Design a binder for this molecule. Sequence first.
Ligand code: BCB
Ligand code: BCB
Ligand code: BCB
Ligand code: BCB
Ligand SMILES: C/C=C1/c2cc3[nH]c4c(c3C)C(=O)[C@H](C(=O)OC)c4c3nc(cc4[nH]c(cc(n2)[C@@H]1C)c(C(C)=O)c4C)[C@@H](C)[C@@H]3CCC(=O)OC/C=C(\C)CCC[C@H](C)CCC[C@@H](C)CCCC(C)C
Ligand SMILES: C/C=C1/c2cc3[nH]c4c(c3C)C(=O)[C@H](C(=O)OC)c4c3nc(cc4[nH]c(cc(n2)[C@@H]1C)c(C(C)=O)c4C)[C@@H](C)[C@@H]3CCC(=O)OC/C=C(\C)CCC[C@H](C)CCC[C@@H](C)CCCC(C)C
Ligand SMILES: CC(C)=CCC/C(C)=C/CC/C(C)=C\CC/C(C)=C/CC/C(C)=C/CC/C(C)=C\CC/C(C)=C/CC/C(C)=C/CC/C(C)=C/CC1=C(C)C(=O)c2ccccc2C1=O
Ligand SMILES: COC1=C(OC)C(=O)C(C/C=C(/C)CC/C=C(/C)CC/C=C(\C)CC/C=C(\C)CC/C=C(/C)CC/C=C(\C)CC/C=C(\C)CC/C=C(\C)CCC=C(C)C)=C(C)C1=O
Ligand SMILES: COC1=C(OC)C(=O)C(C/C=C(/C)CC/C=C(\C)CC/C=C(\C)CC/C=C(\C)CC/C=C(/C)CC/C=C(\C)CC/C=C(\C)CC/C=C(/C)CCC=C(C)C)=C(C)C1=O
Ligand SMILES: CC(C)=CCC/C(C)=C/C=C/C(C)=C/C=C/C(C)=C/C=C\C=C(C)\C=C\C=C(/C)CC/C=C(\C)CCCC(C)C
Ligand SMILES: CCCCCCCCCCCC[N+](C)(C)[O-]
Ligand SMILES: CCCCCCCCCCCC[N+](C)(C)[O-]
Lengths: 323, 58, 58, 58, 24, 24, 273, 258, 56
Amino acid sequence: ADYQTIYTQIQARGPHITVSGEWGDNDRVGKPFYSYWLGKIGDAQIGPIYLGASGIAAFAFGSTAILIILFNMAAEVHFDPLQFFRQFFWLGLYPPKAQYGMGIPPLHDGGWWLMAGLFMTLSLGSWWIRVYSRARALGLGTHIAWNFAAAIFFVLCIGCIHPTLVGSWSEGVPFGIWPHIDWLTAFSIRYGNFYYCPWHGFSIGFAYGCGLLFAAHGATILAVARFGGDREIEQITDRGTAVERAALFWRWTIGFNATIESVHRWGWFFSLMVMVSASVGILLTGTFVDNWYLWCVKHGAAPDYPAYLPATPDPASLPGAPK
Amino acid sequence: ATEYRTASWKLWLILDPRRVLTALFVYLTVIALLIHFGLLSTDRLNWWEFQRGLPKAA
Amino acid sequence: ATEYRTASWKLWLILDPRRVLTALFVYLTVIALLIHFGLLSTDRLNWWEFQRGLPKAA
Amino acid sequence: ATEYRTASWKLWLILDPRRVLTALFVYLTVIALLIHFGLLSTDRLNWWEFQRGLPKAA
Amino acid sequence: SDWNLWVPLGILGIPTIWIALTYR
Amino acid sequence: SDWNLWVPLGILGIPTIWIALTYR
Amino acid sequence: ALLSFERKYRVRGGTLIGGDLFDFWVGPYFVGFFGVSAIFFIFLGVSLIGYAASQGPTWDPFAISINPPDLKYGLGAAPLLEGGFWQAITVCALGAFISWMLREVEISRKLGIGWHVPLAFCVPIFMFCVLQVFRPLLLGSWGHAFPYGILSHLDWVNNFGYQYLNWHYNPGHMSSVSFLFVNAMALGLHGGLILSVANPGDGDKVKTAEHENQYFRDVVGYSIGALSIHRLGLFLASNIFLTGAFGTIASGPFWTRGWPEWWGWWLDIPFWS
Amino acid sequence: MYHGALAQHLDIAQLVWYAQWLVIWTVVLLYLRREDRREGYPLVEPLGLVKLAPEDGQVYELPYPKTFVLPHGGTVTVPRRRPETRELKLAQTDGFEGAPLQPTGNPLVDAVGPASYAERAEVVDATVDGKAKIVPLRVATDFSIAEGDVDPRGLPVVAADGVEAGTVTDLWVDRSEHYFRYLELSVAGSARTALIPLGFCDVKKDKIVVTSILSEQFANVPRLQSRDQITLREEDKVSAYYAGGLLYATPERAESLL
Amino acid sequence: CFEPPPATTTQTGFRGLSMGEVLHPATVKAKKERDAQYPPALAAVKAEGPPVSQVY
Ligand code: BCB
Ligand code: BCB
Ligand code: BCB
Ligand code: BCB
Ligand SMILES: C/C=C1/c2cc3[nH]c4c(c3C)C(=O)[C@H](C(=O)OC)c4c3nc(cc4[nH]c(cc(n2)[C@@H]1C)c(C(C)=O)c4C)[C@@H](C)[C@@H]3CCC(=O)OC/C=C(\C)CCC[C@H](C)CCC[C@@H](C)CCCC(C)C
Ligand SMILES: C/C=C1/c2cc3[nH]c4c(c3C)C(=O)[C@H](C(=O)OC)c4c3nc(cc4[nH]c(cc(n2)[C@@H]1C)c(C(C)=O)c4C)[C@@H](C)[C@@H]3CCC(=O)OC/C=C(\C)CCC[C@H](C)CCC[C@@H](C)CCCC(C)C
Ligand SMILES: CC(C)=CCC/C(C)=C/CC/C(C)=C\CC/C(C)=C/CC/C(C)=C/CC/C(C)=C\CC/C(C)=C/CC/C(C)=C/CC/C(C)=C/CC1=C(C)C(=O)c2ccccc2C1=O
Ligand SMILES: COC1=C(OC)C(=O)C(C/C=C(/C)CC/C=C(/C)CC/C=C(\C)CC/C=C(\C)CC/C=C(/C)CC/C=C(\C)CC/C=C(\C)CC/C=C(\C)CCC=C(C)C)=C(C)C1=O
Ligand SMILES: COC1=C(OC)C(=O)C(C/C=C(/C)CC/C=C(\C)CC/C=C(\C)CC/C=C(\C)CC/C=C(/C)CC/C=C(\C)CC/C=C(\C)CC/C=C(/C)CCC=C(C)C)=C(C)C1=O
Ligand SMILES: CC(C)=CCC/C(C)=C/C=C/C(C)=C/C=C/C(C)=C/C=C\C=C(C)\C=C\C=C(/C)CC/C=C(\C)CCCC(C)C
Ligand SMILES: CCCCCCCCCCCC[N+](C)(C)[O-]
Ligand SMILES: CCCCCCCCCCCC[N+](C)(C)[O-]
């Protein structure tokens, strides 16, 4: 085979050059070290890191959040250290279990949930700023920041916005491995099956889309790596045989192609759209649709199947039923 | 070698004390924890708690 | 060789003490663990607990 | 050949002791484990536990 | 007690011998 | 107390001796 | 009909099967032997869907469905309307897929590029095969496969997953899901990063490769490097299905309890139980 | 009475649905697809009938031009009109639109099909400092191989025949990526070094195996202009030569398997 | 842990929907053995004499 696409056979070492920012060249932190193993898939060098304010802040809120989360998880196993470690995935920080509408709930029932929520929110933001500022610091464009934005917004939607529009904190996602997942099912059951929500559709489309696209783009570049097609930026400004082939390949197959530059747009667009599509769906849910299946039936989208075993009338609705 | 009987010691020319030291430190620590906690998760041989072992009693 | 009978020793020219050592360390530790825990998971052959065995008793 | 009979030995010119050695090591270990645990998962031929076999009894 | 059943002995033993003798 | 249950001693002991004697 | 640079590349040869007779382009499409074959399946398979859907009970595009045969039919053929057409299409499907993939091989041969693309395309094909073919073989019926139908297919996914009591816990799934997410995020970053360097805003000069590196080594303190991201993308993408395929095949043939119960192995290690 | 009901059958969800669609398509069409036509358009025609306009809907098609201001001076405008004026040594099988072409002479030297290169700017690729990006390890003395790898310097280069083509002189490094791009070997029989892309050779413990081309055709790998630096065009030239050999080394590489 | 094949399967809803039960044949056997200790019916007796209310 061609081994040079899978891993790197002969590794290189030498002096790395620092691009001086607009500001905060000073707030780079740590002794850069190498990993020979890591060097077989990517660059081996691992430090330094930029610090600065946004960072500081993000960590600040982030940690507080984490602390509140974990601490409460411990409190669930009554602080038994052995049990904690065994039961860890099953432990969580839950939102309120009674109906208080949108009132700040008691500490012991959802209160702590809410606090961690707010702090997680704040870290996300601080981080956002990091991403956005750094870009501007180095004279790049802001695309990453905007993609990241959408992601954050979707977190907001399922965290507080949706709860708000229906007006109960009870609808919040809980913190914890298994329990954040149990949420998914509950939430779906409640809103009459999410497979039937169109935005869930869209989203998934775009998500699989990403799969397809990365596999394709990924594969395409490696296929043309022999002509130095991995040098993607010089290819943009001075088109070489590499991407000429890459283009041709796709044109001869699906019958239209991209450019080396624009394929990146497509990917960036699909990525974004996952998060956006999602957000919409979440906003609509509870607010305008109560039961997504029934809704799909009102617009006759829903498939209907004959009975295999005899059809069963609901017993509640019989003459002389109990309760 | 200062009146040594074996060559044993040459091991440290082969092995690297810093690795050994550090490894034992960890190794031991873990075994130790396993034993402590593991014991304290039985009914007999749990000090720290009331004998809810209910040894044979009831 | 200093008064040897076999050439056994030449193994270490081939094989590397440090590997063998580090490996054995691990190997034995794992086995030791398996047995210990393994035993302590039975009914006969658990020290560390009240006789869960109900040996013939009922 | 220092009083040999066959050339069998030339195998190690071809094979590499270290590979053979290290593999046999693993191969055997696995079979060993297989048999041990295998046996200890039956009813006849479990030592380590009370005769669950209910050999004919019930 | 190994009576009538030399099966494993044969299986274990035989090779043991010819492994001894073939590769000298 | 090993009553014809020299079994583990057999497995433990035998090699112990030849490991002693073969690599000298 | 040609890109300005297209002509110098349009040369004969590098077909896998049957040489020169099929070696031509219709417009921008390269045909080849497998071109022809693909088309044939596509056309037949689609037509077959239509006819089949015509004798359904609806024509709402979401609501149309071609279901596989009952479980009683085993691994045999079913009446055409009672699951047979399902069978038909499934073959046209495979047909199309494979012809598609081989066509790609022919194309790449002609261009002197690597075969990474076709191969990559092989992964989903396999998963299709896993779900429609293998898993049903192992349970011994076609009736275990999924139906063709936009909403219909999801119903299959849905029930399947509740057959083990909470599919979220199935460890194959966990891995696959993780990849799905990482992949998406990573495409976003890769997308953005190139775009930022190329279109730096204002009359700022286009930046260098070093700026890509700097940027990430700032934000998260590591840069995977330019080639390798491509390599890595391909990897993430691919294990979506590679790992999942394990969880899928497992459910039924190798596990019949709820998926959560399976974590019992850890939850129940008797030491700390 | 219901939340989100615009009629007895019309609800706000339903409307949003279409809305969503609308946007998607718009972006796709009125944007993304335009952005795609920055290279190689407008379409060209060497058979068809009086056409200054692709698939119809599209001669707007091309977006208005960008202007990439380049890192080390100068501007590029996209889309462009970059004309191919190499005179291709390719005869047509038929005069037909989309019937394939036959090379007239040696395809590897005449640079056609998989052996064709793009006419890139005849300049050296640069670092952020203004040094040359791609250089050998005679020049980049600061750079080195990672401890734990095989130094290919000294090894025999074995070609497709099973015949030693020559011996490895050097590695060439990308200074801004810390990555090795080329082996520079000494083609035995002549007094010349030829540059092979590292993606065309399987490096072993003892030998470098080159499946791409035959031993005899190492003599004709494109010559470098300078000794210690490589232009962007020379890169494409070198790469295309070996890849072209994947279809043109032996006559059977043409043919189908049966 | 990785429970070996085959599986008993039934169908409980329309074809192609993936509805129905999935059993490990082994496990069923074990349960069936267990649910067999149900002691057999006692030998039926001839209804003869007065009602127990007058006897006891
Ligand atoms: C185990 C789980 C599976 C699954 C789970 C699943 C979920 C949960 C969802 C879908 C959705 C979708 N799935 Mg499914 N899926 C589909 C296709 C589809 C589309 C109807 C839609 C979006 C696909 C997409 O954008 O992907 C990426 C590819 C892109 C963007 C390129 C374009 C592809 C195009 C959108 C799909 C074209 C297919 C045609 C509509 C129908 C067939 C062809 C025609 C000519 C007969 C195909 C063709 C196949 C097979 C087997 O070939 C299949 C298998 C499966 N899906 C597995 C069974 N899929 C979503 C949906 O919309 O459901 C309502 C959805 O929510
Ligand atoms: C039984 C329930 C189901 C369900 C329930 C469901 C719900 C309720 C929702 C989705 C949603 C989605 N579902 Mg679905 N789902 C999907 C896939 C998807 C995603 C495309 C999309 C969720 C968006 C996302 O990517 O989240 C992952 C990305 C996230 C969460 C963003 C994270 C970014 C964030 C910045 C992360 C960084 C965090 C920091 C590091 C902080 C650290 C924390 C500290 C402070 C402690 C597939 C492919 C399938 C299949 C194949 O069946 C499926 C079936 C189901 N879903 C089952 C039917 N799903 C969402 C949606 O689209 O609804 C319309 C959604 O709301
Ligand atoms: C009812 C029966 C019991 C039983 C039956 C029993 C038997 C029959 C045996 C033991 C043995 C052992 N038992 Mg025991 N047991 C022990 C612990 C022990 C260990 C002291 C010893 C394990 C030696 C070993 O396996 O080597 C594992 C690892 C080794 C040897 C590594 C060192 C060698 C290495 C190759 C050399 C390299 C050293 C370098 C300096 C370091 C290199 C560093 C590297 C990483 C760079 C504990 C802590 C308990 C408790 C808490 O209840 C207990 C209860 C019981 N045991 C039950 C009461 N046990 C064994 C023994 O030999 O006693 C001493 C033994 O034969
Ligand atoms: C209640 C049930 C659930 C469920 C049941 C489930 C099952 C049973 C399976 C998955 C699987 C998967 N699930 Mg899960 N799922 C996932 C995500 C995923 C995917 C990562 C993974 C694989 C999808 C697949 O098989 O593609 C299918 C795509 C295929 C087969 C490729 C089709 C492409 C084809 C080769 C080419 C098609 C070309 C077109 C016909 C051409 C037409 C186009 C036009 C241009 C002509 C998420 C993110 C969620 C969330 C967020 O909750 C979720 C929830 C659920 N899943 C619910 C809990 N899921 C699969 C898995 O891996 O399980 C471990 C799987 O088997
Ligand atoms: C389709 C769109 C996709 C998408 C897109 C994008 N995603 C992005 C970006 C874009 C564009 C970024 O630019 C940004 C980034 O930069 O990446 C490079 C980012 C991010 N997405 C992350 C994770 C992620 N993305 C997910 C999903 C999707 N993303 C969706 C799918 C998921 C899922 C799916 O779950 C996950 C988990 C992080 C890497 C990063 C946030 C960092 C943060 O916000 O920091 C917040 C800071 C903290 C939490 C503080 C940490 C404190 C430590 C651990 C210590 C606590 C210990 C304490 C007890 C004691 C203190 C002592 C201490 C010293 C020990
Ligand atoms: C991890 C790997 C990822 C990945 C990778 C790659 N993906 C690739 C490639 C790579 C590398 C290509 O090289 C190839 C391609 O060309 O690039 C565009 C391709 C392609 N992936 C398509 C769709 C796609 N990728 C999906 C998934 C992933 N991709 C995963 C995530 C999904 C999901 C997830 O649903 C979809 C729908 C087509 C656009 C295209 C082939 C067209 C075709 O196949 O032609 C042949 C067939 C047709 C044009 C029509 C077939 C009609 C048949 C005969 C009968 C009707 C269909 C019947 C089966 C009913 C089912 C419908 C029902 C469910 C309601
Ligand atoms: C004129 C004349 C003589 C007529 C008589 C002749 C006649 C009638 C003859 C007989 C006809 C015959 C025999 C055959 C018909 C033709 C034929 C073979 C047809 C096959 C056609 C067919 C089935 C087409 C369908 C196309 C298809 C399957 C899918 C459409 C594409 C889709 C949905 C893609 C998913 C969306 C997607 C990922 C878009 C991505 C955008 C792009 C362009 C990605 C690709 C791409 C990537 C990924 C890069 O990395 C990249 C890197 C650098 C440069 C470029 C690219 C690039 O373009
Ligand atoms: C060049 O410009 C650019 C850069 O350089 C400037 C960048 O650095 C960057 C990006 C900057 C970065 C820092 C990139 C790093 C971003 C990331 C998201 C990297 C993180 C990746 C991971 C965390 C790995 C993912 C791991 C998980 C999600 C957890 C999964 C959990 C489990 C249990 C998985 C279990 C199974 C596995 C782990 C592996 C299973 C594998 C198999 C079963 C089979 C393996 C298949 C193969 C090996 C392929 C077959 C082999 C051959 C074909 C030879 C970009 C975007 C840009 O393009
Ligand atoms: C000239 O006209 C034609 C063309 O050019 C226009 C063609 O290209 C073609 C295409 C022909 C080719 C060989 C194309 C090149 C070959 C490939 C691309 C390989 C891929 C081909 C396939 C996967 C399948 C093609 C082979 C067949 C359809 C043969 C049919 C075999 C049988 C038994 C049909 C009779 C039905 C029964 C006996 C009932 C029992 C069988 C079942 C229930 C199986 C159905 C259930 C499944 C899950 C199918 C899975 C099994 C497979 C997909 C092989 C044809 C046919 C046509 O003649
Ligand atoms: C107006 C008023 C009063 C309040 C407004 C408050 C507000 C903004 C609420 C909104 C809250 C939001 C956005 C809540 C969002 C909650 C969400 C999305 C939770 C989702 C998932 C969380 C998961 C999966 C977390 C599990 C966490 C753990 C198992 C423990 C945390 C630990 C780690 C991640 C490891 C790091 C720790 C290590 C260094 C030791
Ligand atoms: C459900 C999400 C899928 C969104 C649709 C993706 C757009 C496919 C691109 C078609 C390109 C059309 N064309 C040939 C004019 O270029
Ligand atoms: C891909 C997701 C499937 C659900 C989409 C719902 C389709 C609505 C269009 C159907 C026309 C009927 N309607 C809305 C007027 O009642």
